[PDB]
């Protein structure tokens, strides 16, 4: 599906964060024997969390990755089964080592807190179908599906999940990740990879030369969308004007030559002045000082819109006639 460098560690965490609604999936706590130290090390780490009130609002989810006790913690959803599991863990064997006793004696502090810890617990393992499970869960669980390109979206959200997993694992806190922050990050990834790779691909057309000459300046996507809608609106205005015969069909030659004059004037004005800036920066300055100019200019000796000047500048740059980057003819065409 995605780039499969991420293991099941990130896959099951992202899948369980996908099927949630503002409920923080706390403490992945990777474990790799009924009397093992790391088990009660992990359940002892969640003591101060539920003992405090800044993290648990009685909506958190606790779970484990990779024994009779594990089934006792996993297979109990209600309070009475949690009580029965608590009495079974409290009477299974005598206290073998102090390294587990120091966690067990405080684990037996409160019956109700332990019962709510069991009621939110669900130990899971996962398998090799975890990328397929994440793919199917995102396909049939996400409202407003983005099925045309979901591999790279899952790649970015798995990169975010792996980054927060490493940031939680390197330091001394458990894996506290909320579904709200996960939903915000997945929404940002979805919006970034819908507004650009498909939407902006429809309304600019295989990377035409005007959008590439914009890309040489590497300006933000708001100017990219403004340029695309200006070019489309200018082409549609030409279509409307020559359908109804408003302007004669050679005044675009007198409009485009004058624009060559203004582009040469602004190029001498802004390229000779600095001569010590980066090429992209002086190209950005030339582009903005061209756009705030060439707006009072007349097509067929009458007033024309701002959108027409911007779109004819972009269509003029599309045929490699004018440019924004100082080195643009060697880069393309």
């Amino acid at each position: 599906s995605s780039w499969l460098g991420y293991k099941i560690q990130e896959y099951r965490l992202t899948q369980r964060l996908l099927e949630a609604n503002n409920s923080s999936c706390i403490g992945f706590e990777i474990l790799d024997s009924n009397h093992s130290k790391d088990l009660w090390k992990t359940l002892s780490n969640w003591m101060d969390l539920i003992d405090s009130g800044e993290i648990d609002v009685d909506n958190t989810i606790f779970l484990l990755f990779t024994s009779e006790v594990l089934q006792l913690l996993s297979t109990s959803q209600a309070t009475e089964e949690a009580s029965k599991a608590f009495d079974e863990i409290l009477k299974i064997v005598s206290h073998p080592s102090p390294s587990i006793a120091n966690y067990l004696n405080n684990f037996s502090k409160s019956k109700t807190d332990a019962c709510r810890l069991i009621s939110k617990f669900t130990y899971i393992y996962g398998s090799g179908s975890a990328p397929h499970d994440l793919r199917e869960s995102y396909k049939l669980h996400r409202l407003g599906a983005l099925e045309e390109h979901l591999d790279e979206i899952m790649y970015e959200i798995l990169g975010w999940v792996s980054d927060v997993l490493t940031l939680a694992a390197e330091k001394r806190q458990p894996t506290i990740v909320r579904a709200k922050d996960f939903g915000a990050r997945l929404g940002e990834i979805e919006s970034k990879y819908r507004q650009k790779t498909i939407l902006n691909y429809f309304c600019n057309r295989d990377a035409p030369n005007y959008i590439k000459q914009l890309n040489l300046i590497n300006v933000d996507d708001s100017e990219l969308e403004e340029a695309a809608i200006a070019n489309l609106e200018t082409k549609d205005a030409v279509v409307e004007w020559t359908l109804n015969g408003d302007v004669q069909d050679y005044s675009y030659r007198y409009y485009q030559r004058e624009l060559r004059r203004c582009w040469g004037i602004q190029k001498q004005k802004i390229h000779l002045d600095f001569n010590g800036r980066p090429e992209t920066e002086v190209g950005q300055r030339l582009y903005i000082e061209c756009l705030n100019n060439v707006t009072r200019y007349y097509l067929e000796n009458k007033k024309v819109g701002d959108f027409f000047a911007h779109g004819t500048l972009h269509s003029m740059a599309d045929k490699l006639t004018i440019g924004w980057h100082p080195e643009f003819d060697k880069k393309l065409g």
Binding site: S191, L199, C203
Partner: protein
Amino acid sequence: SEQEAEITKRSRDISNNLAKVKSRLQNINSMNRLANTHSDASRLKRERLSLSKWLLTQNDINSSLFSEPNEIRSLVLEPLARAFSNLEAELEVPIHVQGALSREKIYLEGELTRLASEMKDVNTQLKILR
């Protein structure tokens, strides 16, 4: 105070992000209108260009008045027929493009509500510390 410094820093961040979100919503409404506007303009262009294949066939089957081989057909007419053939396929907005436009519109409405709530509670904390 440094608390006022970080509060003003995050307020500037949220203000610039809301400015970008409003600009993106204005753009996405512009493309939402421009999809059907460019579809209508392309339909009118296709209607004006639909005689080109017929004139291509009557160039193929008839005898011209020009004795010397001229490339007027090769440089004029099949450009128009090729434009007709391209505009036949590039007329209608695709369903996934319109769906992505609508999903981006409702998502930008969602971030408008979210960042407006963020605006509301940050200006409350400004007006309670000052």
